[PDB]
Design an enzyme around this catalytic site. Sequence first.
Site, mmCIF file in Angstrom:
data_model
loop_
_atom_site.group_PDB
_atom_site.id
_atom_site.type_symbol
_atom_site.label_atom_id
_atom_site.label_comp_id
_atom_site.label_asym_id
_atom_site.label_seq_id
_atom_site.Cartn_x
_atom_site.Cartn_y
_atom_site.Cartn_z
ATOM 1 N N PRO A 1 58.163 -2.243 47.184
ATOM 2 C CA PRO A 1 59.614 -2.146 47.000
ATOM 3 C C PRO A 1 60.319 -3.145 47.899
ATOM 4 O O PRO A 1 59.938 -3.274 49.053
ATOM 5 C CB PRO A 1 59.937 -0.734 47.504
ATOM 6 N N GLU A 2 61.325 -3.839 47.383
ATOM 7 C CA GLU A 2 62.122 -4.736 48.213
ATOM 8 C C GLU A 2 63.296 -3.959 48.811
ATOM 9 O O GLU A 2 63.450 -2.764 48.551
ATOM 10 C CB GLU A 2 62.579 -5.946 47.389
ATOM 11 N N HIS A 92 45.638 7.833 44.980
ATOM 12 C CA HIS A 92 46.052 6.933 46.061
ATOM 13 C C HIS A 92 47.093 7.551 47.019
ATOM 14 O O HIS A 92 47.884 6.831 47.620
ATOM 15 C CB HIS A 92 46.588 5.621 45.475
ATOM 16 N N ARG A 111 47.479 -0.170 47.242
ATOM 17 C CA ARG A 111 47.000 -1.297 48.052
ATOM 18 C C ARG A 111 46.638 -0.887 49.486
ATOM 19 O O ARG A 111 46.010 -1.650 50.219
ATOM 20 C CB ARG A 111 48.057 -2.411 48.071
#
Length: 254
Positions: A1-2, A92, A111
């Site tokens: 997310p930015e 995850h 990730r």
Amino acid sequence: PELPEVETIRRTLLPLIVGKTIEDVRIFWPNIIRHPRDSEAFAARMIGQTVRGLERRGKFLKFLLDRDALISHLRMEGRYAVASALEPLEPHTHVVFCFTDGSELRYRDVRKAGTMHVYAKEEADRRPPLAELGPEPLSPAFSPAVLAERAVKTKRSVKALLLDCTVVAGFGNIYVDESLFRAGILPGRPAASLSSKEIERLHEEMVATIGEAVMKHHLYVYGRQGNPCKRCGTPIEKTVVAGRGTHYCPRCQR
DNA sequence: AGGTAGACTCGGAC
DNA sequence: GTCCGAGCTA
Ligand SMILES: [Zn+2]
């Protein structure tokens, strides 16, 4: 997310956790926990604390509890959800905070790239990863004057400068390339080569680009390599600048 | 001295 | 196999 997404998270997550008291903390990928380095101490200190607030600094979320603050970075794919302790966790899921009311705050990250740091509230702002974080891009503290001072004092590229968290907080790669396209500046330009007007314009486009996103495919260059520039039709090009994939129009940007 | 390039992590995608 | 990229070490 930015940054804009992180702000959305801050806003929507807070009502879902405020006033809830932590009864348990479960950690499935310890590498996420950065302070205390020992994930056991991290979990123990948060027990019994009530969530009092949730703030944002750059792309970091700052959860405020009774005594401590929890500082969290999601990187590219991290996400939080509040759900019932009775339901199976999603894939995850790496950290879970369990509340006394049977709900949970869950952190997921395919990730495994995100980070978490806990300190006494009063120390949080003077320790990593918040220490030395530059001004909010949408705050008066981030002004053209501030940008100019950092630009003149460096040999780096302008893109590298904008990517520097000490210069401005949480200004992501997509926003760097879009802001530079909108300001008409090639990303590989030496930062110190930027005129006064160029810095003024860049600051303006930075605030507008990220501001517009915060309020909310309408992209000019990012991910558009080989496609026609939306303003001049020249194929957008992609190269490596400051170690990042960098998109620009070789005609619009100078 | 201290600014800078470098190294470092992850797994989905080639 | 190699690519990618946000924010402690020479
Ligand atoms: Zn163009």
